[PDB]
Amino acid sequence: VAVSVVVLLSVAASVYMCVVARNKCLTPYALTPGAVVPVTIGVLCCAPK
């Protein structure tokens, strides 16, 4: 059962690292009003440009 819980915490840590990478790759498009965002559109649901 400890194997089960360490698997749970490890996969949660992996998802945390991945979403933090996405945020540190995405957040620098917050300012600069014209938000012309490229084909990286696979993330960042479209806001009013």
Partner: protein, 433 residues
Amino acid sequence: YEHTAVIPNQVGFPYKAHVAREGYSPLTLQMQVVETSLEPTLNLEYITCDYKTKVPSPYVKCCGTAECRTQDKPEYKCAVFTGVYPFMWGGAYCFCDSENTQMSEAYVERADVCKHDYAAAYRAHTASLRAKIKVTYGTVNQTVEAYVNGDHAVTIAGTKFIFGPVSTAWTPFDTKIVVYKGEVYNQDFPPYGAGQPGRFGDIQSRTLDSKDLYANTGLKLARPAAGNIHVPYTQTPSGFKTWQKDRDSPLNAKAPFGCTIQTNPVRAMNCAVGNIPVSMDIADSAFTRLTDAPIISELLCTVSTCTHSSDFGGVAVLSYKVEKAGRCDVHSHSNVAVLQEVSIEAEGRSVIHFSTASAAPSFIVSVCSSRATCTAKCEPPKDHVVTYPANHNGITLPDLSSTAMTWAQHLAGGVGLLIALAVLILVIVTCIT
């Protein structure tokens, strides 16, 4: 040749020790113990049996008194009373109305009939084993017997075997042993002063021949009654014959590790206490020169069936291609199983019997300086209980070959790829800055 081993101390478990010696075909020895008695030392404190109240005849006088001239016996109490009118068969006794006097005494001796039914009280100190082995190898198997840690190194057939030292001398004995006719007990016997009568050890003696027993039996006299002649005494019952009831719990019952207890002398045999280290100075003659024992090459083994039985579960057959006719010893280079036999008339086919414990008999089986790997899945047994001990003593749970932990071997996976690639992608906007 000097070579040592570490064998377990369990009756009947066949142990194998394999010797890789140079310039000769390899050698296999087998040994198993039977009567591993822990004969302890012993000491003495005192003895104890029943008693007998040696009462003499009573003494009277007609209007004349007496006193108690002392007598150096054990428990020689005495008294003297007045006011007696002792009838007899012929009725009255004398003519003196109220001046007559009574004399009596009592003294107790260690009763003669306890010379052959006694109880003994011992202190006790460290014990020493006595192993008795069969040594079961290529020369006509001989039997040896030894004190395990006297280091007294008996010899057989040109070879000098030493044993021990045994660990911790773990004993099923307290330090205040008491022994009855064919049994032993653990008690706290009273320290030579019977501060309570009516108990065990109420009377004592240093031996069967000491001339002075000690009794705190609590014996006082009384007064004779009206009319008749007798000697009234009131003392407590015999602490011995009332201790023999409340024994209720030998060391024969509560003995740990199954040690059978015997008397004359006291001894505890066939105990499963720990194990034994052994060393050997092996005679150089009893080997075989490797130009004569055949060198079989081009072999790979197989298996038939496996079982977590106790007696002998798994059978595995082997294939090898002969070059000269002869014989060869076999061995398994790990603890995961033991083998029913020692050698083989090595002509082509070879059937052997092993005993696995739990899950996966990973094997290295050796034939005359040839190694061969072997694995096998198993079928667990269906029975519940048996009437004989185990032969697969090397209890080992885990393994890794193609069935166990394989889901873990696919489970590890994942994470590191994601994080490493994710950060090395993170840099693409955070290395230009």
